[PDB]
A paper describes a structure:
The design of proteins that bind to a specific site on the surface of a target protein using no information other than the three-dimensional structure of the target remains a challenge. Here we describe a general solution to this problem that starts with a broad exploration of the vast space of possible binding modes to a selected region of a protein surface, and then intensifies the search in the vicinity of the most promising binding modes. We demonstrate the broad applicability of this approach through the de novo design of binding proteins to 12 diverse protein targets with different shapes and surface properties. Biophysical characterization shows that the binders, which are all smaller than 65 amino acids, are hyperstable and, following experimental optimization, bind their targets with nanomolar to picomolar affinities.
Unlike antibodies, the designed proteins are soluble when expressed in E. coli at high levels and are thermostable, and hence could form the basis for a next generation of lower cost protein therapeutics.
Author numbering: 1 to 60
Write the structure that this text describes.
Amino acid sequence: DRRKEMDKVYRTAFKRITSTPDKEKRKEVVKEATEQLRRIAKDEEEKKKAAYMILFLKTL
């Protein structure tokens, strides 16, 4: 259940980042996505998935 909520935050951030022309605006979404993912994950395996998901958003 905690993983499906983490997939929502990631997939929702993706759509917003992938369709926002402003460079500075996208940085604010991934920053917002970063905080919500770090707060929704406390397990070791969970936090690793958030690490990759945050990494994927930033390289966009």
